[PDB]
Symmetry: D2
Subunit: 249 residues, 4 copies
């Protein structure tokens, strides 16, 4: 019935973008998908693929304990966690507000650590488990006026390595993908509202060796590969999905 | 009938180890596999999988032009090249002989560049192409008494990025895998002939988060993934297949 | 006279180890050094070098605003900040407590961001400024049972790049050092309390190409260099001071 | 007297650019400088700083043995080697000619290995020694139509780590600098001969956080630092001198 047939898969930020594409990809391969999101529209994504939805605020450590226990119950097992949900807070260190900074770290860095520990305790039961963290090229490099995101993704990259060492004894592999510019609704809104939308999109495309935006589907393929038993000797790895963006200037 | 159904796939060093496992993996997914090797036993690997064999010395620029022309003829098309063949010359810069050094660079660095140029001209004809270079953790770091291999693999890593930029216009993706310790015949011979074979193997295992050697099969799975259209937005990437080796100390 | 003659230098964690060595190094080159620490013995380090001491808890955002204002007042200018102070919370993601994790992030990642913003506002006045962050090889890799430190140092590395981009317009350079194992009092306490102290120290030494522990003085030399106008075209750099530790396995 | 007072320093490509700036910097700190170059104007650089000149073609293994023996004779000791001389061959893997590629590897990768081995045998005599390799951001990344330079600099970076491990036992430290765009005569000629010279220079400047070209002098400061006893716990390091170029896109 497919590559993830009867496997329990948790996916954060599953309502839109890469998260939705990942939930869809796992369902297509016969996974029992539990997805969470702040946005209530997440309900319709889970309905559409035959999986479970949970309205969660990942900023809240109690809401995170809740999400994993209820998802494990709903699916009957946990085999894969995908930490995909992230927020940003615009500004340099000069301009960013401390409470905004602290919120971005909680969601982007603390929540993935917490959830990996919770999900790991469930993965012990059956055969092997796997965690995939969705970072960004903006974990390996910086852009202007985005300190909180750069810092949190840097942390997420080294947390991926830490979790790989610590959870190998429990037969759990942990890897990350680092996407380039992906044509999600949010990036299309940003381009659309720029002064010269076509010039903006051309400038973004030109940064990639492949001279085009990524598709959420293309990120999900990498995630499926890294969560799969085909990747049985891959742990601690940070895999760019950026059409050549980080190979040049 | 499979993921590489009717595709022409060239594989260097295909007689044993990772190369054999890669040739086998592609054939299993319905590829027309042409494999080359110095070793004449390569004949029996090609017979066994229903592919073409060519006895080639990659040190020779004429033997490399020959291999690609004959393979393209035999298969009728070229879609994927795997640069897997490599040699080493024991010694630091102090102890290595210049002709030995120059030979290692020719095979490990010049040959992959040459072969990528030859195979690329054939990939233009039909739909899209892909190249996968098999490096080593010893391209991103050094070990003692192995200067030629460290240098050539360093070159191979940055050649992978160069080829990704330069061949994107021809709809060709180029990535590398960086294996950890893989239980090939050669590594098992080395362990077996060490004074305390079990102590040697335990020390090698202990360097990896997964506390075991890799299997050639597990490297091939990464190669298939990176050569496949599932990896359609991955180019310029170096993917470790090292069970956590490069994530820790 | 000297290289930092009449310059105001802020140094966190200045009472012992690398911090003390940095405060001493700057003073030796004629700097007005303001150092903070929780430890009251910091007083004797400042007295000894002719600089200012402040007992500060960097966990507290008000105590951080206080430290920079009072230091700027005491010295009459700010030219250099060194973010050296750091804490750990032992444990994997499985075993670490959330409030401990959050505290390590506040001190190791939030405090350096905050302090860089505060010190930057003072650096505007005279000519150019510089910030140096003291990370660790444990920002670029992981060790077992140290998730909070690994994550926070990963963040510190990418924060260094973010600050370099954001503050370059204000003529402020921002770099980090990534030390190997340094023979500070804290590391000597850890060795001393291990079951076989000499076996522990030999194992640590053997991980470095130089087969010895670093000296706090040797880290301070890197910090002075990176804070100096000799480094006038170096910003965004993470400079290992690890005697070859991260060049091999 | 200065920091390199009475020390013998070998510098390749010393006639112009970074090489000249390095030879000048070492002499200023009281070094006995032997510099080589193809260009006979090298004579006037050596005269000007009170050092030795040798007309050498580094492509020739005999001319390299010659250079080290004669320099060691002229200076009476060898303490420091700087591998700075490098060539390029324009073209992708598609477009570059094999003999051109092989020449670039010989000069950029084989010559530095050879010279490091020769100089190391001289460094045994007195106390400690140091080698500094001048790479480029184009050793850690690629640009279009520059395969031979990208590959050779990739090799130079990993050769630096290899030499650091292999030569640490002989009390020899080995590091590299990776410069950004440096305003040498050659880069200024290239800008000057472009259609819109100011637009060309602005685009180059805009790639660096500091939004300006580097000065040869600023690379030389890094080289002196890394060759100096201030860097006594720095070996195997690749230090970018790129005004933040490799920290963003």
């Amino acid at each position: 019935m497919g590559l993830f047939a009867g496997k329990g898969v948790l996916v954060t930020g599953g309502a839109r973008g890469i998260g939705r594409a990942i939930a869809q990809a796992f369902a297509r391969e016969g996974a029992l998908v539990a997805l969470c999101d702040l946005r209530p529209e997440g309900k319709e994504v889970a309905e559409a693929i035959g999986g479970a939805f949970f309205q969660v605020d990942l900023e809240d450590e109690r809401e995170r304990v809740r999400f994993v226990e209820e998802a494990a119950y709903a699916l009957g097992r946990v085999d894969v966690l995908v930490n995909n949900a992230a927020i940003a807070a615009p500004g340099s260190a000069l301009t960013v507000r401390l409470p905004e900074w602290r919120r971005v770290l909680e969601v982007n860095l603390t929540a993935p650590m917490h959830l990996s520990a919770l999900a790991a305790r469930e993965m012990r039961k059956p055969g092997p488990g796997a965690i995939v963290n969705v970072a960004s090229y903006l974990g390996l490099f910086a852009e202007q006026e985005n300190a909180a995101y750069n810092a949190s993704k840097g942390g997420l990259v080294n947390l991926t390595r830490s979790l790989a060492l610590d959870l190998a004894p429990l037969r759990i592999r942990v890897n990350a993908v680092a996407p380039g510019f992906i044509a999600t609704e949010a990036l299309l809104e940003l381009i659309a509202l720029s002064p010269d939308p076509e010039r903006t999109r051309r400038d973004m495309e030109d940064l990639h060796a492949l001279r085009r935006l990524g598709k959420p589907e293309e990120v999900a393929e990498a995630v499926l590969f890294l969560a799969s038993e085909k990747a049985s000797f891959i742990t601690g790895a940070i895999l760019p999905v950026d059409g050549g963006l980080t190979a040049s200037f």
